[PDB]
Amino acid sequence: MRDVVSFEQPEFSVSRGDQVARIPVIRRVLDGGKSQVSYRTQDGTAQGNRDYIPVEGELLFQPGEAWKELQVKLLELRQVRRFHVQLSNPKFGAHLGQPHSTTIIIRDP
């Protein structure tokens, strides 16, 4: 498979006070053209509009592009909560690699 798109890790840890989770997505084995995948947050114990700002959209990789950083906003309110991000719907010859979902662990300062 070429143009394989994945999260770099299955889990990331962030402090709530950081205001943003910076989530890396990579594309490997580039064939030379564009690739697209969809992405979406999904609540776990962290909930949209309470713990973070939900987002969904498309990641369009132009020729040569090997990574992106998603930025999901974190909201301020011992405590640990998690939300998820999922890749789906590869287009233009893209494929999903492992891991194609990830968990963002929000910890207190």
Swiss-Prot record:
Subcellular location: Cell membrane; Cell junction, Hemidesmosome
Calx-beta domain location: 2-88
Organs and tissues of expression: Integrin alpha-6/beta-4 is predominantly expressed by epithelia. Isoform beta-4D is also expressed in colon and placenta. Isoform beta-4E is also expressed in epidermis, lung, duodenum, heart, spleen and stomach.
Record PTM text: Palmitoylated by DHHC3 at several cysteines of the membrane-proximal region, enhancing stability and cell surface expression. Palmitoylation also promotes secondary association with tertaspanins.
Family: Belongs to the integrin beta chain family.
Disease annotated for this entry: Epidermolysis bullosa, junctional 5A, intermediate: A form of epidermolysis bullosa, a genodermatosis characterized by recurrent blistering, fragility of the skin and mucosal epithelia, and erosions caused by minor mechanical trauma. JEB5A is an autosomal recessive, intermediate form in which blistering lesions occur between the epidermis and the dermis at the lamina lucida level of the basement membrane zone.
Domain characteristics, as noted in the entry: The VWFA domain (or beta I domain) contains three cation-binding sites: the ligand-associated metal ion-binding site (LIMBS or SyMBS), the metal ion-dependent adhesion site (MIDAS), and the adjacent MIDAS site (ADMIDAS). This domain is also part of the ligand-binding site.
Subunit structure: Heterodimer of an alpha and a beta subunit. Beta-4 associates with alpha-6. Interacts (via cytoplasmic region) with COL17A1 (via cytoplasmic region). Interacts (via cytoplasmic region) with DST isoform 3 (via N-terminus). Isoform beta-4a interacts (via cytoplasmic domain) with DST (via N-terminus). Interacts with RAC1. ITGA6:ITGB4 is found in a ternary complex with NRG1 and ERBB3. ITGA6:ITGB4 is found in a ternary complex with IGF1 and IGF1R. ITGA6:ITGB4 interacts with IGF2. Interacts with TMEM268; this interaction prevents ITGB4 degradation.
Purpose of the protein: Integrin alpha-6/beta-4 is a receptor for laminin. Plays a critical structural role in the hemidesmosome of epithelial cells. Is required for the regulation of keratinocyte polarity and motility. ITGA6:ITGB4 binds to NRG1 (via EGF domain) and this binding is essential for NRG1-ERBB signaling. ITGA6:ITGB4 binds to IGF1 and this binding is essential for IGF1 signaling. ITGA6:ITGB4 binds to IGF2 and this binding is essential for IGF2 signaling.
Listed name of the protein: Integrin beta-4
Organism: Homo sapiens
Lineage: Eukaryota, Metazoa, Chordata, Craniata, Vertebrata
Gene: ITGB4
Parent-protein start and end of this portion: 989 to 1105 of 1822
